Amino acid sequence: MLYKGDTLYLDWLEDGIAELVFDAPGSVNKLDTATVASLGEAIGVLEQQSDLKGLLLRSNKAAFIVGADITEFLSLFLVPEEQLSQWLHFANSVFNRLEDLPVPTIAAVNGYALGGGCECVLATDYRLATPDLRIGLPETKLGIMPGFGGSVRMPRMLGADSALEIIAAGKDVGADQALKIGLVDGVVKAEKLVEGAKAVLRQAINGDLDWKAKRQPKLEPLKLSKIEATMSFTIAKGMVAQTAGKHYPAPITAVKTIEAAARFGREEALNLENKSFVPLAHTNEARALVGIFLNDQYVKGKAKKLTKDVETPKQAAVLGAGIMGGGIAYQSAWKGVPVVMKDINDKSLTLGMTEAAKLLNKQLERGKIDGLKLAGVISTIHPTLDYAGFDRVDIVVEAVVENPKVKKAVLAETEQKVRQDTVLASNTSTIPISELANALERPENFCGMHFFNPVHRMPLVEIIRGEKSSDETIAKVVAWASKMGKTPIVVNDCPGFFVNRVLFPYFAGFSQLLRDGADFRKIDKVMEKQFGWPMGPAYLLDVVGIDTAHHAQAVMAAGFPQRMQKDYRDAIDALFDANRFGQKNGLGFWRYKEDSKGKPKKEEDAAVEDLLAEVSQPKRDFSEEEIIARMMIPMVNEVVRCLEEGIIATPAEADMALVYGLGFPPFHGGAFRWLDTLGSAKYLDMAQQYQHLGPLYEVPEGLRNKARHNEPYYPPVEP
Numbered sequence: 023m024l025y026k027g028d029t030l031y032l033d034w035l036e037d038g039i040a041e042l043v044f045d046a047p048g049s050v051n052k053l054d055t056a057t058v059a060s061l062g063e064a065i066g067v068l069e070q071q072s073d074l075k076g077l078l079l080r081s082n083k084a085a086f087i088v089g090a091d092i093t094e095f096l097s098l099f100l101v102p103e104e105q106l107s108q109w110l111h112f113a114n115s116v117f118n119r120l121e122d123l124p125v126p127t128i129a130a131v132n133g134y135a136l137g138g139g140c141e142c143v144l145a146t147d148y149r150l151a152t153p154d155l156r157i158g159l160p161e162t163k164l165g166i167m168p169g170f171g172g173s174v175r176m177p178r179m180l181g182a183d184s185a186l187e188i189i190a191a192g193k194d195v196g197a198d199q200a201l202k203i204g205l206v207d208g209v210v211k212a213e214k215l216v217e218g219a220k221a222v223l224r225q226a227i228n229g230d231l232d233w234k235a236k237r238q239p240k241l242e243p244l245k246l247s248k249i250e251a252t253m254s255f256t257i258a259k260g261m262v263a264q265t266a267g268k269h270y271p272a273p274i275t276a277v278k279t280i281e282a283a284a285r286f287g288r289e290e291a292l293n294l295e296n297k298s299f300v301p302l303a304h305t306n307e308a309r310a311l312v313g314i315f316l317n318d319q320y321v322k323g324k325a326k327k328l329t330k331d332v333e334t335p336k337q338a339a340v341l342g343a344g345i346m347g348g349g350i351a352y353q354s355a356w357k358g359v360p361v362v363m364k365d366i367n368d369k370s371l372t373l374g375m376t377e378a379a380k381l382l383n384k385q386l387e388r389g390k391i392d393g394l395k396l397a398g399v400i401s402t403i404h405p406t407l408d409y410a411g412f413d414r415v416d417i418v419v420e421a422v423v424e425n426p427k428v429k430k431a432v433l434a435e436t437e438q439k440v441r442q443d444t445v446l447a448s449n450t451s452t453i454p455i456s457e458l459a460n461a462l463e464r465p466e467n468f469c470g471m472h473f474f475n476p477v478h479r480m481p482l483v484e485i486i487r488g489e490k491s492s493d494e495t496i497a498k499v500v501a502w503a504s505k506m507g508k509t510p511i512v513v514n515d516c517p518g519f520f521v522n523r524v525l526f527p528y529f530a531g532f533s534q535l536l537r538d539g540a541d542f543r544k545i546d547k548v549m550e551k552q553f554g555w556p557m558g559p560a561y562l563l564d565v566v567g568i569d570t571a572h573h574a575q576a577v578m579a580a581g582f583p584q585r586m587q588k589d590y591r592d593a594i595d596a597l598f599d600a601n602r603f604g605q606k607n608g609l610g611f612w613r614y615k616e617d618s619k620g621k622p623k624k625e626e627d628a629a630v631e632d633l634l635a636e637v638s639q640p641k642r643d644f645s646e647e648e649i650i651a652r653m654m655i656p657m658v659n660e661v662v663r664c665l666e667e668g669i670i671a672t673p674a675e676a677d678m679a680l681v682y683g684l685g686f687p688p689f690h691g692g693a694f695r696w697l698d699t700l701g702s703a704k705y706l707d708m709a710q711q712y713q714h715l716g717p718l719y720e721v722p723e724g725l726r727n728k729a730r731h732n733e734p735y736y737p738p739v740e741p
């Protein structure tokens with residue numbers, strides 16, 4: 023053969039047509055730094071063969087090219103801007119040489135073709151795909167942008183409108199959409215893919231297809247009028263501004279460069295893509311978004327290891343079938359594991375089966391599941407009032423009232439209606455698992471399985487290990503949590519566990535701000551519009567319930583009297599005593615009127631200000647820095663203690679718990695990512711100003727040691 027590399031090879035085939043195959047040593051092919059180089063040597067061989075009449079690009083793997091190697095991304099983000107620009111300029115010169123070959127080219131695209139993989143197939147003149155194709159440029163989801171001609175070829179291939187939507191939103195289209203749009207020239211089955219991708223090629227060599235007329239639009243300015251240009255780009259700039267006033271600069275950057283690079287050739291369009299990819303690759307957001315992907319692949323990787331030799335449970339059950347019970351029953355049955363949902367009255371069983379069917383109805387809305395086959399999974403949910411079928415279940419969760427007496431009572435009973443080797447789980451929001459373990463005969467089959475509202479939207483399943491929770495029981499809990507399409511995390515037992523434990527000091531600092539005379543309406547503004555929380559402290563406290571927060575603040579105070587007990591009377595107490603419980607009864611920090619569709623909207627109350635002035639000092643204007651610091655320091659100080667105390671295993675698990683459990687802003691990456699993005703020693707000097715407010719603002723000794731040398735929590739890793 024002509025050229026053989028570690029990840030790809032090149033050989034003659036058929037009748038004077040070459041064949042470049044991406045055959046990586048692993049399971050998926052990626053355009054890593056070596057593969058881009060190995061491609062450069064392969065194309066150069068094609069440039070010195072006078073007998074060349076055709077070129078075919080294909081893959082021996084299930085997919086085509088998964089993309090660039092993300093394990094190199096954090097290292098690529100660190101090289102200086104000039105060096106990264108020069109490399110990207112010459113990495114683009116590789117694909118330009120693929121595109122400029124004096125020969126009809128085509129890529130037989132199979133399976134996935136994301137990121138650099140799609141940018142590769144755009145260089146060829148023709149593209150032929152398979153019915154299982156998924157193709158797109160999801161580079162803005164990681165904070166960067168198409169760097170290998172994606173923002174140049176796709177706008178000139180698909181028309182500006184369709185390319186702006188794919189690139190900015192970072193989406194991938196299917197086999198049917200790609201042909202309709204223009205990404206794909208034809209769809210054939212994988213068997214006929216290799217042969218069919220040479221039939222289209224030999225139409226081109228015999229002059230039937232004008233291939234350099236099809237190649238030409240990718241080299242020329244966009245065929246858009248001034249009126250069409252301004253129209254097309256405000257739709258993209260408007261659809262990007264739709265996404266909640268982004269702190270994310272990647273989607274708007276990707277759009278604005280394609281706009282600036284319109285009416286330009288391929289050289290300047292690649293130049294404007296290059297000059298904007300490098301600054302994006304250096305943004306703290308791009309590091310945090312890529313760090314989330316690697317941490318996600320590590321969390322789910324650790325999942326397969328714990329669950330490597332434990333069979334998944336076949337029959338499941340939930341105890342507590344309200345809205346949360348319907349979500350737990352839906353999510354388990356919707357992914358192939360039956361459920362047994364039981365309450366104490368039928369009005370909750372209907373309300374649970376109702377909610378469980380609404381979630382399936384949304385799957386019927388689009389991405390349709392067969393309504394005939396939709397009934398095949400709600401029929402898998404059985405609303406029982408007695409203990410029917412509990413003999414034939416393998417695991418069960420308790421999603422009952424937040425009350426230790428009822429939890430211990432209903433756990434010891436359902437234990438008796440259930441076999442010995444069967445596993446029990448608890449969705450307690452705050453009660454420690456080791457305490458509930460004393461009310462069971464077989465504690466070795468009991469642990470904490472903790473969902474988060476909204477259950478279907480928040481994918482974290484906080485899994486807590488009791489003192490006698492064995493290792494086999496947790497693997498069964500992690501196995502079921504994974505099969506439900508949920509991202510699980512294992513923590514050690516303590517009151518509040520990790521997610522709800524670190525969130526309370528965030529609330530305590532909110533009560534301490536209001537006590538010092540702050541405005542809860544502006545505090546919610548700063549935490550939502552600037553830090554990026556989906557909901558600020560006060561608004562969130564109303565959807566948790568002012569009394570649920572009032573009760574949870576008492577549980578966390580008896581568990582951590584060292585530093586989680588307050589001396590004064592706060593907003594949570596004053597609001598609770600006025601029977602204002604939040605969105606629950608429509609009265610809380612705000613007033614919640616029913617809107618037209620039924621989504622309660624927050625409107626201001628007059629009696630809430632006069633009620634807060636009793637528990638507060640005179641109104642004091644705090645800066646956004648004071649608000650952000652006084653709200654975030656007690657939380658991150660807590661997530662660090664959960665690391666040193668062994669509650670959470672690693673910084674990667676803690677950040678994924680915050681991102682997927684509390685909706686921690688992904689562009690911040692997490693508390694530890696934010697703690698590394700900010701100066702590790704700078705954090706102590708920032709926190710020393712507020713160290714006198716309470717023991718929560720006192721940085722733990724472990725971080726106080728690392729702040730001596732500005733030591734981070736994420737070690738710089740190799741790929």
Ligand SMILES: Nc1ncnc2c1ncn2[C@@H]1O[C@H](COP(=O)(O)OP(=O)(O)OP(=O)(O)O)[C@@H](O)[C@H]1O
Binds near residue numbers: 365428
């Ligand atoms: N003694 C009990 N034994 C078993 N289950 C119970 C008991 N009391 C309540 N439950 C169940 O616990 C679930 C939640 O109870 P409930 O509706 O009282 O929630 P809640 O915590 O009071 O919420 P809110 O305070 O917002 O109304 C319900 O499914 C209910 O059937």
